[PDB]
Design a protein around this ligand. Structure first.
Ligand SMILES: C#CCN(Cc1ccc2[nH]c(N)nc(=O)c2c1)c1ccc(C(=O)N[C@@H](CCC(=O)O)C(=O)O)cc1
Ligand SMILES: C#CCN(Cc1ccc2[nH]c(N)nc(=O)c2c1)c1ccc(C(=O)N[C@@H](CCC(=O)O)C(=O)O)cc1
Ligand SMILES: *c1cc(=O)[nH]c(=O)n1[C@H]1C[C@H](O)[C@@H](COP(=O)(O)O)O1
Ligand SMILES: *c1cc(=O)[nH]c(=O)n1[C@H]1C[C@H](O)[C@@H](COP(=O)(O)O)O1
Lengths: 264, 264
């Protein structure tokens, strides 16, 4: 899509060569923002085929507070394979912090439920937030949260959300992330009887990997196509009852997919 | 400042009537981002008389992990009197989380010192972050962190930082917050022998209080003037050893000041 392609070109134009953890090398810019009016279509990149299926499973995996790739493998999702340990454990990452942030005094904060309640009984709150950046458990996670801080907002019956992604692999990761939260907004919006608003994406270290250049140029040479439409065949009792079969994608006519090696 | 006046003007045209935890009412938008290249000058609003004293004391206060308004009240800084308790306590706010974020297992993380080391030994890191949004303590705090999460970044010998402010009172707080972080950047920079880069400001609920409309139109009629230059007269041996008398501002020729009420 346009915002995405423009972000690619932006990095290409004013990015700086920078070494990195993986040792792969990147071209990066710091700080960026784009918006997607969910009412214009589900934001699923078209300049290359994307498997919305793997995205759904990763999200449902979070909403259950699970952090062992076992469930993912149960559905053929290999996105955690290069970092999980022998027991398929990544650590107290996304899921654990989302449903059960451990307080030093014994409590466990279920943030998703907190936000839900706020959206229903206090949509005006400016503190409707979910954070995966729990400093106290960083060292235990197999990898630091990329999408680490998001906020919800409601106005004129529309639900919006902005994500803060401290680190972002524009070519391989961004498309997953955008679709992820966009998806979460629909679900929340459905449970809270609200319409979908905008999904504001904000980034920190927005980079393009040295070995993703050729593919980026290939995608950037393709013309974006109409955005598809998210279809939820059923309204579950809670935001914790969605299953992969409840989601449907219509009108998605993406360009051929493009493979690229991930930096471990 | 141009960017600030553009944001202020945007809230007017596109803003939406909302209601806040303070029966004051507001006109807000959700999600915005501005960029301040510190190389062009210290970002201290000029279309309104301001001063660093309070901002300086607060930051030094934060850097010490202090959360009691004694230091502030001492030098006559009232910014936090309307919310502290009979003992001057605000609870575990900003400074507490910055210098001693409590893990779930009896330990405390000094995020500042951590970042200090990350910039000196691992500048390419995409995990140099500081958060005050400790979910397990949000209910022990007198007030929820507005400037709740920020990140650092290095490139070509220049330190840059981005702040995620989930709640922002455009007329009153923004000018304070902006110059506050800018200052921290210059401080971190000196402490690491780096030069200052960009201060990226990102906001969630960006509102304009309904009882600030008059002073907003007044400020909008003024022409921004050249930004001033910051001078740190001494180089402490620690980012925690700075003294109020270390800061100077040269070339600040602002328009008259504008008084406004604080939504409690
Ligand atoms: C984001 C996210 C979730 N994750 C988590 C995750 C973990 C580490 C990461 N590390 C790096 N350097 N890039 C990422 O974006 C990244 C993302 C993913 C991880 C890998 C792939 C991946 O390589 N997909 C390939 C191959 C697809 C396939 O197997 O069919 C692709 O071409 O998309 C996708 C998602
Ligand atoms: C941010 C921050 C710290 N704080 C914290 C703080 C707490 C609650 C808030 N509440 C609201 N509605 N907006 C804010 O910006 C805000 C700021 C401050 C609190 C008050 C003032 C204040 O009343 N300033 C006046 C007078 C300043 C002067 O003496 O020149 C002003 O109009 O500037 C400034 C900062
Ligand atoms: C992390 C996973 C995700 O949800 N999205 C991504 O974009 N990323 C990328 C960022 C970076 O290239 C890598 C994480 O590495 P690091 O922790 O920033 O060193 O995956
Ligand atoms: C909080 C303090 C700060 O450092 N900067 C500010 O702009 N804010 C403002 C935001 C909001 O108008 C008010 C706090 O409101 P709430 O806690 O989000 O309801 O202070």
């Amino acid at each position: 899509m346009k915002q995405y392609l423009e972000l690619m070109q932006k990095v290409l134009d004013e990015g700086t060569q920078k070494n990195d953890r993986t040792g792969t090398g990147t071209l990066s810019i710091f700080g960026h923002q784009m918006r997607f009016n969910l009412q214009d279509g589900f934001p699923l990149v078209t300049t290359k085929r994307c498997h919305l299926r793997s995205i759904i499973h990763e999200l449902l995996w979070f909403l259950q507070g699970d952090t062992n790739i076992a469930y993912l493998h149960e559905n053929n999702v290999t996105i955690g394979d290069e970092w999980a340990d022998e027991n398929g454990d990544l650590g107290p990452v996304y899921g654990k912090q989302w449903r059960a942030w451990p307080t030093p005094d014994g409590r466990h904060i279920d943030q998703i439920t907190t936000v839900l309640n706020q959206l229903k009984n206090d949509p005006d709150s400016r503190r409707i937030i979910v954070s995966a950046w729990n400093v106290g458990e960083l060292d235990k996670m197999a990898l630091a949260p990329c999408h680490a801080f998001f906020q919800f907002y409601v106005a004129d019956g529309k639900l919006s959300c902005q994500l803060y992604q401290r680190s972002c692999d524009v070519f391989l990761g961004l498309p997953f992330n955008i679709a992820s939260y966009a998806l979460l907004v629909h679900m929340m919006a459905q449970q809270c009887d609200l319409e979908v608003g905008d999904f504001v994406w904000t980034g920190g270290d927005t980079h393009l990997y040295s070995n993703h250049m050729d593919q980026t140029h290939l995608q950037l040479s393709r013309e974006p196509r109409p955005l598809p439409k998210l279809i939820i065949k059923r309204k579950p009792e809670s935001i914790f009852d969605y299953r992969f079969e409840d989601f449907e994608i219509e009108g998605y006519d993406p360009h051929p997919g493009i493979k690229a090696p991930v930096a471990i």
